[PDB]
């Protein structure tokens, strides 16, 4: 198994190597919620070894809709997100890393109430 907890210590997914892909950065729902990948690497340019790193994905809707998508680990150096749109509208989201910032963000994605 490439991905696996061999010791005690692990090193920092950073802001030119980590990035993230799929249907919940294009298109989101009301009674389908939508899934995407975060592709995380250290600097090794090999995938993360193991898993568990802390991250956030923060987004705002129009007015009170402030989210945040939820994540789950795939042990294999990716991360599943889960999130959810009541609205015909915008969600503008924000991604982070130990709760440090990165590169080329905030983004955007249409909300549609299906």
Same mark, same amino acid.
């Given at each position: +198994?490439?991905?696996?907890?061999?010791?005690?210590?692990?090193?920092?997914?950073?802001?030119?190597?980590?990035?993230?892909?799929?249907?919940?950065?294009?298109?989101?729902?009301?009674?389908?919620?939508?899934?995407?990948?975060?592709?995380?690497?250290?600097?090794?340019?090999?995938? =993360?070894?193991?898993?568990?790193?802390?991250?956030? /994905?923060?987004?705002?809707?129009?007015?009170?809709?402030?989210?945040?998508?939820?994540?789950?680990?795939?042990?294999?150096?990716?991360?599943? /997100?889960?999130?959810?749109?009541?609205?015909?509208?915008?969600?503008?989201?924000? /991604?982070?890393? =130990?709760?440090?910032?990165?590169?080329? +963000?905030?983004?955007?994605?249409?909300?549609?109430?299906?």
């Amino acid at each position: +198994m490439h991905h696996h907890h061999h010791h005690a210590s692990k090193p920092a997914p950073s802001a030119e190597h980590s990035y993230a892909e799929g249907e919940g950065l294009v298109k989101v729902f009301d009674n389908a919620p939508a899934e995407f990948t975060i592709f995380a690497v250290d600097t090794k340019g090999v995938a =993360r070894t193991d898993g568990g790193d802390p991250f956030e /994905v923060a987004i705002n809707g129009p007015d009170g809709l402030v989210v945040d998508a939820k994540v789950t680990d795939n042990n294999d150096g990716t991360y599943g /997100v889960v999130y959810d749109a009541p609205v015909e509208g915008n969600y503008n989201v924000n /991604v982070t890393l =130990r709760g440090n910032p990165i590169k080329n +963000m905030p983004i955007d994605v249409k909300c549609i109430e299906g």
